[PDB]
Design a protein around this ligand. Structure first.
Ligand SMILES: NC(=O)COc1c(F)cc(SCCNS(=O)(=O)c2ccccc2)cc1F
Ligand SMILES: N[C@@H](CCC(=O)O)C(=O)O
Ligand SMILES: N[C@@H](CCC(=O)O)C(=O)O
Ligand SMILES: [Zn+2]
Ligand SMILES: [Zn+2]
Ligand SMILES: [Zn+2]
Ligand SMILES: [Zn+2]
Lengths: 258, 258
């Protein structure tokens, strides 16, 4: 059976090839997770189809209904067999889906427009002139809502009540807002994405301060999928062989234009 | 039932307290893994006894007999219920034991005596005046014994054939060898241990170069153990509370004396 892979359009993980209208199926896409999907499928011995998550979301549970959206939702409700995307391993997600060992490390980080007078999360929390926000329906927002760490809870208190809204629906929207706002919007997003964007034209953003936490992305499968075990062994093999490092280099740094 | 925890004397993960005499059982020990064990035990709801691996090794499989030694062997042969130690997640181990998601990241690194004229692994490989080696029965030696990277394979060819032997039985022996060889021995070990030692008196070693790979330590249980699931959930939770970040600062940065 063709394994249905859910993923998300997020650079440089999955992107539309420039001539994708003349290509078919998996060939329409390129990027880190496209290359990785090919390798996981080869080492696990399955055929597969890449499908972009319909609602364009990573995955969170609605607080009132308790329905999961995004890629998590496609797995939970049986629409996809596997997710190969920059999907963060979290405890609440682990209650409903399974994750491989992580294939890439990351932490929450701060993106500013160059010259913004902020060097840290503590800096951000202590002022109001520069607004700051995070992506909707993702692990970064949930991180702040739940955190018991003084500085991060102070940030949550501000963000949840800030008007106009400081949350964005896609990473690209957040990045554009940073670039537009003349230094008055900072964006909280994962270090991997922050680092990619810093090396992309117009080279007008940068990552400041240390990461706020330390986690990783995992390949996710529905609970009790037969695929879980083989996928995990494939991730370990590819790490040890050096593939993951090679792919990071290909899509981040060899890709660099600043 | 009291859970038998296997671990290994390795700073700053598990150390006999200087002062101890009036202490018994688990109380004799201190360290990152000692603190982590107490947290895992509290979140999983079990009592436990810390035991130091009998053969003082992490664990490797004998090529001729296929018997596993070290902490891995203690799990495989049913001599302990769980290992809580800086035990590297590897493909060959995952075939015989289960690991939690990683609780700490590390990479292979180079330790020199300060002033040694080496800045990289490439430097080591291209010369012969300065000897170099690694720990026996651990993941670092296997890394080299398997690597296809030109520089690392060149290092392997040298190390496996060097006389006298460049391999050591314990990390402490490796560190002593660096300290007392006047810059003529360099030691390959994990970044975590290297960075700890660099901030300890006599402050005469340092980490040079970047890491050679990127991996993680996991909590290990015997295949199919009934502890596995609860332990993984606990590592997830401790990470998201930040407790793991807190213990890292306690045992690395608060321990600095240089
Ligand atoms: N390519 C790689 O080597 C990346 O793999 C790793 C790794 F080896 C270690 C870590 S430590 C950070 C926490 N480990 S986790 O991401 O599996 C996690 C996430 C949330 C709760 C508990 C544990 C990270 C990597 F990505
Ligand atoms: N990687 C995140 C999405 C990005 C973010 O939340 O910053 C997740 O899995 O939800
Ligand atoms: N962490 C290693 C031990 C130290 C080393 O090999 O450098 C292991 O689990 O085997
Ligand atoms: Zn391959
Ligand atoms: Zn004593
Ligand atoms: Zn606790
Ligand atoms: Zn033998």
């Amino acid at each position: 059976k063709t394994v249905v892979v859910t993923t998300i359009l997020e650079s440089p993980y999955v992107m539309m090839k420039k001539n994708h209208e003349m290509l078919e199926g998996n060939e329409r896409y390129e990027g880190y997770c496209v290359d990785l999907a090919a390798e996981i499928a080869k080492h696990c011995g399955f055929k597969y189809k890449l499908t972009i998550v319909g609602d364009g979301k990573y995955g969170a549970r609605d607080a009132d209904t308790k329905i999961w959206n995004g890629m998590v939702g496609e797995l939970v409700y049986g629409k996809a067999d596997i997710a190969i995307a920059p999907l963060t391993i979290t405890l609440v997600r682990e209650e409903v889906i399974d994750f491989s060992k992580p294939f890439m490390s990351l932490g929450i980080s701060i993106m500013i427009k160059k010259g913004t007078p902020i060097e840290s999360a503590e800096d951000l929390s202590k002022q109001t002139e520069i607004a700051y926000g995070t992506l909707d329906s993702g692990s970064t927002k949930e991180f702040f809502r739940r955190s018991k760490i003084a500085v991060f809870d102070k940030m949550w208190t501000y963000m949840r009540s800030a008007e106009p809204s400081v949350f964005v629906r896609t990473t690209a929207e957040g990045v554009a807002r940073v670039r537009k706002s003349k230094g008055k919007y900072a964006y909280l997003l994962e270090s991997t994405m922050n680092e990619y964007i810093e090396q992309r034209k117009p080279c007008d953003t940068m990552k400041v301060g240390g990461n706020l936490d330390s986690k990783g992305y995992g390949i996710a499968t529905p609970k009790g999928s037969s695929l879980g075990n083989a996928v995990n062994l494939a991730v370990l093999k590819l790490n040890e062989q050096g593939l993951l490092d090679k792919l990071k280099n290909k899509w981040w740094y060899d890709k660099g234009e600043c």
